[model samples]
Target: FMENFQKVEKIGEGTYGVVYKARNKLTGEVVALKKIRLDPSTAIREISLLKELNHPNIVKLLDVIHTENKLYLVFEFLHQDLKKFMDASALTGIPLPLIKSYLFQLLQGLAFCHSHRVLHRDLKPQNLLINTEGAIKLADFGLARAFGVRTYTHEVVTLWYRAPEILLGCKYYSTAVDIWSLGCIFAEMVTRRALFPGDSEIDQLFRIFRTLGTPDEVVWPGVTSMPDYKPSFPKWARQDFSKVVPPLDEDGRSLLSQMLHYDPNKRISAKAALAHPFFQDVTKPVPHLRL
Candidate 1:
């Protein structure tokens, strides 16, 4: 199997190992080869889950190649990530229709994951892939785990996108954690910048509080019970949604607000989010293409 493809170039490196662009010598098909280190559990989990998951909006694992010292997982190639796409569109700004389409695809992919009992604990702009045709797909499940946690680490998601309850040290969380991260990504798409670019975990919590207001028993019934919750934290009022996401219309803002709600139970689910009025005009799912 290894002899069937030739390496084109090195694309990225992470804790997993190096990634390379490769082409099939016979078919001319391009794919991403992610070389992973010898970690039995991590490799097993990612491979097993990817094998069971099949969705057009999620990156597909084409094959797995095992070697003496490493494991290589092949994935369908995509042109760029959401971060790079956002940077290129900064000057012109992504059109609202395009933004709506991207987000709808995002939610569709996430809904599929959630329905399969998986939690993409590390969802960020970099983990979202976009091809030339403008279709977006969720990728990178290295940190993913099955939902319904008996206990979960606080060190899962990146600082800026981590949900408030996780910041408050909640050991038991649910799919709502992903919803909060999605909200952060949604805001970043509209602004072309990170909504809360915090330097530290505590700072991240402060930024969230300043924007969404300090939660109380009435708003978040069990918030005070969280391990890191502090009653002395300075109170702030919820920032106006229209001002934060100025370009969005009423329905868009309404949908964003629900996703960003302080109470996890109140946050919109991926399936429900897809049915939002903001996407009513989106009409069709964006088509995905091979690189």
Candidate 2:
């Protein structure tokens, strides 16, 4: 209730609403609040999933208070976005150690979502909120959904960050899709650029194949059976990992290879990926909880 908290400065404008920083009256705890429209004619429906979503790494949905035609979504306060952080001038030529710290936290948040079987379909730098203290929080769940609950029908996620399996109309796809997106994101974070800038889904898949090679039967046994599988040109069959992400070191490159596997079945899961050598080497000196 407005009586319980004093609204502070405006944070930013959201697609369907406005975001603000507020202070809780009872505890004086600062929080982020999103005021979303509630009119059925234009309101985007994500309330059910948001209500059920409860995870520490993921942004905590504090409470949903409502008025006649608008709803208030209370959330934990976070300072800025990963996109803004990466764009900062000082971030250029950033050492791999700090990069890994950000990644570990990203993965930690993603793993929590995957464990709950929720697909953060739109995983991108802008959706990742960060604090001045270097803590990361996954936000903007307008496109996220409860996976494996009923049926997989949604075809949504950021274009550049989407996985190939999802691109191919594989409704049965699992958390592997998120892993692939994360892999692309990891490479982008290191290089400070988009990994695949295809104009269309077909072009995106071809770009992936040209750089990462097509999925062969040996590597992906069920490629043909996939709902949207399209055989790629043989010319795209030859790719070396060294060429795609040249900036990454051996450990980082190796991890990207596994995470970006063409076959959904072969793609890494978030939990298994946490044990990756890339993460292992980076998290050794810095503890995992710092994530």
Candidate 3:
């Protein structure tokens, strides 16, 4: 199987291994070849999870090839990642319609994962892939895990998108964690910058509370009981996020507020978010590939 394709160039490197753009010798089809050391547990988890996930908005695993020393996974080729797209859009800024479309697709993919009881622990722009046709698919499942476990580690999501609960040393969390990350991503998309650009974990939590106001027992019950909970903090008033992202209307702000809630239970689910009034006009049934 490895002989059937030829490497073009290196695309990226992640926790597991390196990725390269490859071409099939017979059909000339392009694909992404991710090379990883053959760890039985890691390979099994990724292969099994990806096999069960088959949604249009999720990246497709084309094939898995095993060599004596290494393992290679093939995936459908995408032109660029969302981070690059956002960086390119920094000059003129991304249009609202396109932002809505991209976010809808992101939610649709996340809904499928949540429905299957899978948690995509890592939700960042760099992990989202986009094609020239404007199709976006969620990628990088190395940090993802099923949610039925007894507990999970707090060291999952990227620091910028990490939820408050995780930062407060919560060992057990739900899909709401992803919702918080999605909120940050949405805000960044609208503003073309990171919502909470913190330098460290403590700094990140401070920035969040300072921007959204400190959370007490009223808003977040048992917050003080968290392992890393701290008492000393400046009680800052919540800034008007609409003004932060001027393009976002009332509906958009409402949805974002819910997603960024201190209590995970209060956060909106992916399915519920899809039905929110903000996306009523923007989100509709559309074909997977318009090209």
Candidate 4:
């Protein structure tokens, strides 16, 4: 069902296509409408992913209507992205309390999706939407998919937010992969920069090991059998967490440690993370209130 159009403003441009801001004529509600070229290759996955997702922290997918040769995705409007929030002169140097709140909300949303067996393969600062109230809304499910299917999937996260297994080319992963990403994002929030800024896949793995250390059957059991496990260099010593992100405070380090645990099976699940002491100050179920 199509509705009347209102004022439209160009918002962003990227690999998928250009995004524009439009208002629903009848309801006067502002929304983001993305128009991607007529290509079924990517549309099929994105359409299918959005159809099944429904949560508060995750961006709401209003509708997916297509024309003869084009695809249109309508989403609720967000003021800016997490990257913008980090860069803003006024918003820079996010305090731990505030960062914890945002991270809590992010995990809450992720917990919901993980419960349904969905993994947001691509979780990056730019993919997170933040409104003026500092509410963090997880957006961009373009690369997200159902996990635990036992297939050879490629490295899924963006360069900065990607996980160690992805860097190691682990064919089989679980919701833990996304938790690793959440770890990177949490580090970024605390340090005001990215945690493991690896140049390439190999370098990325090294960077992770440099901090969290190399994986063995003990920590990441069964890692040796992966197709891409072999490395040109001798197994460098596993990382010492304290030295990797030396600047993080105690609470920040605890949260990061839980999320960045190397063992996929040992990694803290989203539901458990929601109850972590990190959010003890905020009694409300949600992380942040409108500010």
**RMSD list, candidates in order:** 4.1, 5.4, 4.4, 4.7
lDDT of 1 by residue, 1-291 (tens): 467687567876643566788997888899888776443545455665576678878998777777666577788988888877778878877777788888898899889888987777668887788876667888765344522222232234357888888889887657888888988998898988898888887899989888888889988999998899888888988789888888878998899999998889999999999999888889444433333
Candidates' lDDT values, in order? 0.78, 0.69, 0.79, 0.72
Question: What tens-digit string does per-residue lDDT give for candidate 2 at 1-291?
Answer: 476678576777653356778998888999887776333322334554566776655777777666655667788777677767667723454457867877777788788877766667657776777765556678755334422213222333236877877777776647777788778877877887778867777788777777777776777787767777756445466576687778688988887888888777777778877888787755413212212
- The lDDT of model 4 is 0.72
**Number of backbone collisions per candidate:** 0, 0, 0, 3
Candidate 4: which stretches are off by over 4 Å? 1-6, 25-27, 37-52, 89-92, 146-157, 283-291
Model 3 error, position 90 (Å): 1.2
Q: Could you tell me every candidate's TM-score relative to the true structure?
A: 0.86, 0.77, 0.86, 0.83
- Which pairs of residues collide in candidate 4? 213-238, 213-239, 214-238
True-vs-predicted CA distance for residue 83, candidate 4, Å: 0.5
Model 3 lDDT tens row, 208-229: 9888988898999999899999
Tell how far residue 136 is off in model 4, in angstroms.
0.7
Error of 2 at 139 (Å): 2.0
Q: Could you give candidate 4's per-residue lDDT for residues 18-62 as a string of tens digits?
A: 678888888889998876543245545556567678787889878
Which is better, 1 or 4, measured by TM-score?
A: 1
lDDT score for candidate 1 against the true structure: 0.78
The candidate with the higher lDDT, 1 or 4, is 1
Candidate 1 regions off by >4 Å? 1-5, 24-28, 37-39, 42-46, 146-157, 284-291
